[PDB]
Design goal:
alpha+beta; ph1033 like fold; 6-stranded mixed β-sheet; two-stranded antiparallel sheet; 5 helices; 10 strands; binds ~{N}-pyridin-3-ylethanamide
Length: 161
């Protein structure tokens, strides 16, 4: 079903995350972490304090697809075990965000072609710089397009809100 998913997404904020390679998204899927440039880290930390759920929607560049989406479970923090990101220097990254995956399945851009993002000139939601915020209605509908991920139990993430 989609009811718990809709509950998690209610009044959420959404951010497009663009990765240059599949290895970084695989690492994020395995370890439940993300790291980004400070301009976006600051935006994500502000959003985390401001909304019940902050959703990151991942897309590997040139892949033609989104690779899933996850919910921020923490503000960024420094001093953890170093994540061996494959970058485009590691000091240039900000802190690390803990994330809880909501869907690890892919969605091709062909399926989201009817969704435009008001915060990026109503261009199709697939188009945007890393860190681009997606307006609430567009972001909710995009997340609802993903195939259900039956390996994830959202009871756990609901208890964090
Ligand atoms: C994990 C990751 O790929 N972070 C990143 C790299 C380059 C630019 N912005 C963010």
């Amino acid at each position: 079903g989609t009811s718990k998913l809709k509950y998690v997404l209610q009044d959420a904020r959404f951010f497009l995350i663009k990765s240059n390679n599949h290895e970084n998204v695989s690492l994020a899927k395995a370890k439940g972490v993300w790291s980004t440039l400070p301009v976006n880290e600051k935006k994500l930390n502000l959003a985390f304090r401001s909304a019940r759920s902050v959703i990151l929607i991942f897309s590997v560049r040139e892949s033609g697809k989104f690779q899933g989406f996850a919910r921020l479970s923490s503000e960024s923090h420094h001093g953890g075990s170093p994540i061996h990101w494959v970058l485009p220097s590691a000091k240039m990254l900000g802190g690390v965000f803990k994330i809880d995956w909501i869907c690890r399945r892919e969605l091709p851009f062909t399926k989201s072609a009817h969704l435009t993002n008001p915060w990026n000139e109503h261009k199709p939601v697939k188009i945007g710089r890393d860190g681009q915020e997606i307006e609430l209605e567009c972001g909710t509908q995009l997340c609802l397009l993903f195939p259900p991920d039956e390996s994830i139990d959202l009871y756990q993430v609901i208890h964090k809100m």
